[PDB]
């Protein structure tokens, strides 16, 4: 009865969505009990027929920050940073500039004055582009005053974070941080051996979609990964303790709440709510406005530990795909929803709210 009840469960909760937005492949994995439970559906590929499973990998966009937290986690507790640090501490080409006033700590939690959602279309990957940008940038409002979601600011933190270990972005989260989480089936750079499991992504009149290069984009967007790894993220999440002292010590620091916008509580990566709530609230905190407008912030007097009764998620999309990963500390409770097509928000924690209700 147990595995035929999740099975209606999940596949109740995942088809009419699917069906609805148009979905050709979607992977879910649960984390219930302290075991792991799959459910795979549909194509990977259209054209090839290549079906979903749970070592499909995917695109999870800016789900991708809670791995950048993490490393930015390793530098803290490595005493290689503060969170209270300037920016141009890391980066001398920053010297100088605004980031002389702006804290890492701003960065991480898109607070550094207006840094907008996306770098404009006019820088490329390119170091001297990307510098230039940040030594000619101006804060819209002051540092540490208004939440602007924003990928060149978390990229510069994840971007400093990496110089404050005195190693490139991509090597550490290569030779380091995916090898201590036990992670074999994520990447940043799909090696060939392993492009048969990568899944195509889908947009209008189901144009083939998969992400190309930008800057900053390991930092911000830069992880293709499978259903079964994030869900092993999700495991070390739940259970830093499992790993070795260093590698536990940087999951907790990505379970520190700085301050509240609405019903949303902002960490390093991952953004926090009180649980249970309703399935609207959980929607309005992941959608467009809370994205792309800015909002005052409420400052907690001390950092806030994101466990017991709460929520933790990331949303994260890319031209093709969409990834939503939820977890809720206290219950040893995780999920992950990766598909490819990039459908709503709202869809996304729907799914998830669907599941979480009826196990609950
Ligand atoms: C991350 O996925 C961010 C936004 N995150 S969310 O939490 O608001 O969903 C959604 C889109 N996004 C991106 O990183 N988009 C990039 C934009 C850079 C160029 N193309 C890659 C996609
Ligand atoms: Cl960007």
Partial sequence: APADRLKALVDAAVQPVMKANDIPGLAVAISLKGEPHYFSYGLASKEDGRRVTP?????????????????????????????????????????????????????????????????????????????????????????????????????????????????????????????????????????????????????????????????????????????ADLLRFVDANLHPERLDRPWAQALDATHRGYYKVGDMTQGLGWEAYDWPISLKRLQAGNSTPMALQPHRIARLPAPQALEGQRLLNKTGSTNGFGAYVAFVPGRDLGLVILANRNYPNAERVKIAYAILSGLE
């Fill in 55 to 227: 070592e499909t990998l995917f695109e999870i966009g800016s789900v991708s920050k809670t791995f950048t937290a993490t490393l930015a986690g390793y530098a803290l507790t490595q005493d290689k940073m503060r969170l209270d640090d300037r920016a141009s501490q890391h980066w001398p080409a920053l010297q100088g500039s605004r980031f002389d006033g702006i804290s890492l700590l701003d960065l991480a939690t898109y607070t550094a004055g207006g840094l907008p959602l996306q770098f404009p279309d006019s820088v490329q990957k390119d170091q001297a582009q990307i510098r230039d940008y940040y030594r000619q940038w101006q804060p819209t409002y002051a540092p540490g005053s208004q939440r602007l979601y924003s990928n060149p600011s978390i990229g510069l933190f994840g971007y400093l974070a990496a110089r404050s270990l005195g190693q490139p972005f991509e090597r550490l989260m290569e030779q380091q941080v995916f090898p201590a989480l036990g992670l074999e089936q994520t990447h940043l750079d799909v090696p060939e051996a392993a492009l048969a499991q990568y899944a195509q992504g889908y947009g209008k009149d189901d144009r083939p979609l998969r992400v190309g290069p930008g800057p900053l984009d390991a930092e911000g967007y830069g992880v293709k990964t499978s259903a």
